[PDB]
Subunit: 149 residues, 2 copies
């Protein structure tokens, strides 16, 4: 992906709190085509620190995971400093309703559409679809309302 | 789905021969979100009979399967008479390049875009995307050129 695509003027503090993963897309099928695929994870909560890092509460196959994404020089880009280099890229958010982001396997690329509340609305899903057009995506997933919880 | 969506004036004889599954979509994630999901099958060959039925050579997880789809009153709609009622619905084809079809769990619905040859072209993928707009699809899959074989 390009920095052109990442978010401008992100305030990390305002993304705090509860989120729900409404849809996912990935550049290769293997990343999402099974409950136990490595990036088939559901964001539960986001928690900025006072130091500007991003704590991420995930659900996997479900287990609770916690990962820390440290800030980098580029804003809206965060580094999950595990053994295998993974970046978190925030593409866009209005903070109060939706948040789009991707994960890069520093090649592969999985993105998500996050919503604050399962409120009936499709701004997120529209804006997400409109951002994925510019990226190569080979698998694409949307969760119905019984899938949320 | 509706009969409005199925193909008009299908000649079953002209779909004979080799095909490749370039993309799949389904109404529920579970139908395709794993190599061993029940409708994660790849058409290898189609073989009309002189009696107007449709033999279907599939690849699964890969194993070779063979299933017979018998003709019904509605043309372009075929019945896979197994224990669990499954219909095959041909939505459209020009015979010489693409073929779109769905499978119904008489509720659930998985469709595919089939091409004659991995020839670089995107009529099939365009016409497929344009037919899926009218159907509820929650998982969506496209195969790159190393995935074909």
């Amino acid at each position: 992906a390009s920095v052109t695509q990442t978010m401008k003027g992100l305030d990390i503090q305002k993304v705090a709190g509860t989120w729900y993963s409404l849809a996912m897309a990935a550049s290769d099928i293997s990343l999402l085509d099974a409950q136990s695929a490595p990036l088939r994870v559901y964001v539960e909560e986001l928690k900025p620190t006072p130091e500007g890092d991003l704590e991420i509460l995930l659900q996997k196959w479900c287990a609770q995971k916690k990962i820390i994404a440290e800030k980098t020089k580029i804003p809206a880009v965060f580094k999950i400093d595990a053994l295998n280099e993974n970046k978190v890229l925030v593409l866009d958010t209005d903070y109060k309703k939706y948040l789009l982001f991707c994960m890069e396997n520093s090649q592969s690329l999985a993105c998500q559409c996050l919503v604050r509340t399962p409120e009936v609305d499709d701004e997120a899903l529209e804006k997400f679809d409109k951002a994925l057009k510019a990226l190569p995506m080979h698998i694409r997933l949307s969760f119905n309302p019984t899938q949320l919880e």
